[PDB]
Nucleic acid binder design. Sequence first.
RNA 1: UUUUUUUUUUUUUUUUUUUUUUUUUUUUUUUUUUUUUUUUUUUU
Lengths: 229, 229, 229, 229
Amino acid sequence: GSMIELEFHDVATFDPEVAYANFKRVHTTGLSYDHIRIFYIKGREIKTSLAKRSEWEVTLNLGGWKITVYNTNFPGNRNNPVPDDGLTLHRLSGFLARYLLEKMLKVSEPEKLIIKSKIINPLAEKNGITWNDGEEVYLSFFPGSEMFLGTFRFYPLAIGIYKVQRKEMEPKYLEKTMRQRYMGLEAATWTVSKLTEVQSALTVVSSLGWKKTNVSAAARDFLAKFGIN
Amino acid sequence: GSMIELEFHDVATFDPEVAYANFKRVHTTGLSYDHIRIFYIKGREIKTSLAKRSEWEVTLNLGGWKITVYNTNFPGNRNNPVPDDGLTLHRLSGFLARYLLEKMLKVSEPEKLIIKSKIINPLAEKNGITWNDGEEVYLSFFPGSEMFLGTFRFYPLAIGIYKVQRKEMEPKYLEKTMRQRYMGLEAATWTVSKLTEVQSALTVVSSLGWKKTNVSAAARDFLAKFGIN
Amino acid sequence: GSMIELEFHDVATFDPEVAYANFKRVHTTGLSYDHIRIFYIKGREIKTSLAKRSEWEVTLNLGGWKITVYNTNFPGNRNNPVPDDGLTLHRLSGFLARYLLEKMLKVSEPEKLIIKSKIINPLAEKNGITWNDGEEVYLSFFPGSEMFLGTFRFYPLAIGIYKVQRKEMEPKYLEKTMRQRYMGLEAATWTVSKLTEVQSALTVVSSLGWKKTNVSAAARDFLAKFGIN
Amino acid sequence: GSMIELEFHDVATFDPEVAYANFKRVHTTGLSYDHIRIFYIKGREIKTSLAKRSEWEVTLNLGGWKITVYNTNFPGNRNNPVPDDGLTLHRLSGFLARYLLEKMLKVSEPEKLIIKSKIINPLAEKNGITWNDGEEVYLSFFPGSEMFLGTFRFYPLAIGIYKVQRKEMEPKYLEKTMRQRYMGLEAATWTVSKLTEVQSALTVVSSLGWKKTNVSAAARDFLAKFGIN
RNA sequence: UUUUUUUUUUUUUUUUUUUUUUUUUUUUUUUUUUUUUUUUUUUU
């Protein structure tokens, strides 16, 4: 027979605005609102199909649009460094959410209606929140939005906080959010410096009214009459 | 080595009475009460064996009777469109429950006794409910019955509501029921229009007395004397 | 390609004392207390190793002793009829527990000490119960003992009842016990006829003092001083 | 076909200080603080990678350092005797924790700073405890430390007790600790003989302040203001 | 009357967790989308 020897060795950065800058410059040239809605709608499937394949670098063909992404989803590929100028599924989702929010402020009133028609946010909709509830809010439901707490005016965090305190999400999912800048301010500084910003941001989200299930309006009420969620 | 590219593209109906009509016309010619009892009794196994095979279209041989069914049970086959004139295991179960309830009203008093002897409803029996408790009630325990809330006089819904409020079933399983017609009325209209119908329907089901376990009568009581379910 | 057809068909007894009789006659000729202690001690492993193999009929070689058992443990083999004169791992365990209890009453006082030294009951010991606590009690911890509630004077049931009411076991595991005879009496008759028998039987078991963990005597107490089980 | 026979047979020690002695003599010749930090940091991965391979005896190459370990982690390999002079992952972790604590008492004040810089204890750090909180405490977080309750002055036990009573760990994980010596004293003797030692040991650990999550200081407080852990 | 739970011993055997503005992963993903997901009778 035989005897294996397995080896190990010692060990011992990234900001979003520059990674976003670079992305916008290179990639968003040949890109359209149809290409984006594809990405967000099929986000569910794209995550799984990537988690199956073992190939470290994979390309997505979203309609016409095509991007190369580091497949950090596959179990084996996790926890191996990703370049500061690299794209993961997560970062991509965040960038695109920024990209849209920018358009949604600098573009034509009829053009805005093309966005609100085409682009659907699975996670916001499931929880009974639509474009109508606020363009900055709706888009901050997209994962990756927390990279830009500045741009999204603390809603990524507010949405999280509202979910943990109503038992929906676990405390550990707010970890990444808390290691993030606000405008320029670092974690501890803004934690109280801008506490009242977050206070109001939560106030906004708390009014919106989540959706436990994907049901009717009358259903919500009707079922509740016998003791329901 | 290699590097995969995987692609995606955009996206963007069915009523039971017509699907049932068509089914009854074509399929229930060479069919018998023995063929049905087979389907419902071995329903457990039929679901699993279908969930194993990957073949999108499969045929069932229930004694003499033979049907072709779209195998929507297999994990890979889920969420790919099923024709409005197509059969799934679920729809089949519902149709057959309608079919029986129709017979049970338009047939001979000795013929009814052939039904009550032969046809067994696993789910109703497990929960300590028998034919004696009402032919419309017993049959509405079969999955698919919710497609015809009219035909079954709101019992499919009542049974569900009684189960969630006593913690047995999860809230999300009443979703499909709530997207369904009643006679002609749509969800929101009947939700209150026919609220008192459902009120009484629940009253009926609540009297019947479920069975936590598959035990004796004396057992129920005896065990309870030491602090039991 | 292809298209599968899978088929199904209709469907539509055992007493322990005769199955035990037959077993004792044929099998317990070339058998010893060493052979038994093997069976009970390695019961853990014997269950698993049988659950791996797919062979419907398997033989056990317990030291010298050798028996043929229907491998009803393997997932695929479950729920296919077992002859009334057949042996399963469960039945075997029950029979051997009867067999011992019989010896333990009809044999020499020094011979009894050979039993109490050699034969160990994993499940009774884990729960801090030994031979000292009663030969009829200790042996009724062996699975299969419930087949002979008569022989074991309601302890199989008492032990169960004591476990569910202290949250250790789930209610459904008392199902099999309740479909069993007592002397000659059937379920409902003895349920109250002999209620006071069971009352006292529980009284006995409740005094014995279970063991949450496999720890010391001082440990029990010591750890408890900081708020412990 | 075929028909299997599977066989079984009857059945019917170790002190740490001698196993440690032997280890220190033979193995810690060509060994360095860099080699150790590797072992503890990658402990997570080393456990899994060993649990995959089925080879009963495996060697670790921790930087330069190389050891042979009995792979008792692999499911199949569990519960087959390990020599009293043998190494398991667990024992190794304990020995190395002793080894360090010894150095940390008998070495130069600048040399101590090399240790505190290089060697990281994943489990202590996760729970917000650092070298600063006490060299004997920090090191007793390493698994295996309970073999030497003497050397570590009851902290291995105190840490456990503090965790079960605050619901973090399950009661059964204190089993191994309780079957262990203290100086020379056996379980029951020291359980009260040295009760006040453990009392103070717990007092120490209870002051240290655990960390539910891996978050900031301001985060701890900030999140708590909306009802948080 | 088949299975599922739990299977002794200062047996020292496994099972729980495993750091670092680690920016990696883990949670959950739109439409009266009618698609799956839940349970499945009897001295079984």
